[PDB]
Symmetry: C2
Subunit: 330 residues, 2 copies
């Protein structure tokens, strides 16, 4: 195990030029930790918030949220994992050849002899599926018959949400920026389609819901959609605001939730997988759905780790559908 490795990091906030592919230390591990050599890591929109200074982080800051790979070292007290075990896990600093995580943390042991193709699939699906599952179970518990507004409907999280909402018998009103995206959203389970580049979103939502509004809004767009979601919600509806793609929602007076008794939730994945029991619940569900092919994980493109800047530009351009994946160099 080397002293140094290649990672993607940022030294400061800014545009794509601040993304660096550089030598960086391999982390040391404690008695309960795993050292994992990564093979694949998923691209997630959140990296843009850190890069732009929307979310704070101590810099130099190694990027990444999830990875799949192989345990190459373990602490003295680790019995639930073996060296050579193939794993998928949620962790920072995963745009890297080597990352560490607690053996008690959000790491799942994959079946022995898992292939590289499957490893890529798990790296592509893990974070976004866990997010979709937990947000539709706990943030707002989606019921059969619910009308649900879904923004960024053909994106990574969006395509998983489409599938889950269909499975649950919800009526999904999908919003995306092109007709070609909405076609894919439909393929993935969306019932009603709104092209935000052509149509009045609120007017269409009210049309599809008989003027009543939606039971819940799963809205990852933030600033530019806040007023639309609030207006589109039915009385007693639930607003799950879970992203900032168009910017942060400015500070608001919670009195605005009152006329329609709107419930507000601004969740993050971590808070639903924080215990071993919560992690086992959702990671087991993730595995079952993906393995049985009940959930499809659409991969837009795979890029070498050093090409993350291209992936960042692609996803932020709004051109993409599904998941972008980065191949970690051996």
């Amino acid at each position: 195990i080397p002293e140094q490795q290649k990672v993607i990091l940022i030294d400061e906030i800014g545009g794509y030029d601040v993304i660096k592919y550089e030598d960086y230390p391999v982390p040391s591990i404690s008695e309960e930790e795993l050292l994992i050599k990564n093979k694949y890591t998923g691209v997630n929109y959140i990296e843009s918030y850190f890069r732009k200074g929307i979310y704070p982080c101590e810099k130099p800051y190694v990027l990444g949220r999830e990875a799949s790979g192989t345990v190459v070292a373990k602490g003295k007290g680790v019995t639930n994992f073996e060296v050579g075990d193939q794993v998928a896990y949620i962790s920072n600093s995963t745009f890297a050849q080597y990352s560490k995580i607690s053996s008690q943390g959000p790491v799942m042991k994959l079946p022995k002899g898992t292939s590289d193709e499957e490893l890529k699939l798990y790296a592509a699906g893990l974070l976004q599926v866990l997010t979709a599952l937990s947000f539709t179970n706990e943030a707002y518990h989606v019921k059969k018959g619910d009308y649900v507004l879904l923004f960024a409907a053909a994106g990574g999280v969006g395509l998983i949400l489409n599938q889950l909402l269909k499975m649950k018998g919800a009526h999904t009103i999908a919003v995306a920026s092109t007709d070609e995206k909405l076609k894919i959203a439909k393929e993935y389970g969306a019932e009603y389609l709104i092209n935000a580049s052509k149509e009045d979103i609120l007017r269409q939502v009210l049309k599809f819901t008989n003027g009543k509004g939606v039971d819940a809004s799963f809205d990852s767009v933030g600033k530019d959609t806040f007023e639309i979601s609030l207006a589109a919600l039915k009385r007693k509806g639930v607003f799950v605001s879970f992203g900032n793609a168009s910017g942060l929602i400015p500070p608001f007076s919670i009195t605005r939730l009152s006329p329609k008794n709107i419930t507000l939730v601004r969740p993050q994945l971590y808070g639903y997988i924080a215990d071993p029991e919560e992690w086992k619940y959702y990671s087991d569900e993730f595995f079952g759905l993906v393995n049985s092919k009940k959930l499809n994980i659409k991969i837009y493109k795979t890029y070498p780790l050093r090409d993350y800047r291209t992936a960042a530009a692609d996803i932020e351009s709004r051109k993409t559908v599904g998941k972008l994946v980065l191949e970690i160099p051996q």
Copy 2:
């Protein structure tokens, strides 16, 4: 039916001197409305928000939220009520000898022979019981074994919540400004007591919840308890912010709900009794609980309508427990 009556109104914002006991027209009614002669009307803290300019209202503004009385006139299209019916109802402009409401609104027909004491009881209990029922059913669905933080615990809504939370098998952590008030909260079902005037609230909450925090906070205090509730909540906890006794909560970034996946609700009673089906559900439940004295309605003091200003001063002084009621001389 007279053309003129007496009411309590405000012409402008300010202190108690702006509360006026004034001549005012008896309202004209539409074909679907009832005219009700009031006997009793409850005091509610919300009147302070309108008087101080915290909540906007068109002035001159007649005060009141709830009353009990007798139907003295109805519109030609009304068949679900008769002249002579005794009623309990939720309506504005009820600090008055005569008020109107839609026959399709939140008004309930009381049994023939309802006594004067019962009329008083219903006017004392209606708004606060409906609030407590709906907020513990829908705003946050209280479960057996939940730890629940309760501010203003010996107040009108507070004493109802203490009783309901106990009935549901929840564990109430009651917060109030004196030991004497807390003794009453305990009598009404509180399991834990915190004197906000001399204790470290968060430290006591963490003691009582064994470090976990509360499952929900029912917090009617607003500005000055915002931070404490957020800190006191368990991971995945629900914040039911439902009053502004200390002032409005200033605008804040909803990302502050993210570290603990906190659900936020800022409900108003109306939004849970907005249609005939919802109104029937909660008003039937209110009646059973209050008529049977399963729920106790503590009356602090009864004032004549003309003396609302003393009641306003009393409740705002923080010296009161339970409900203040206004009696209208007939």
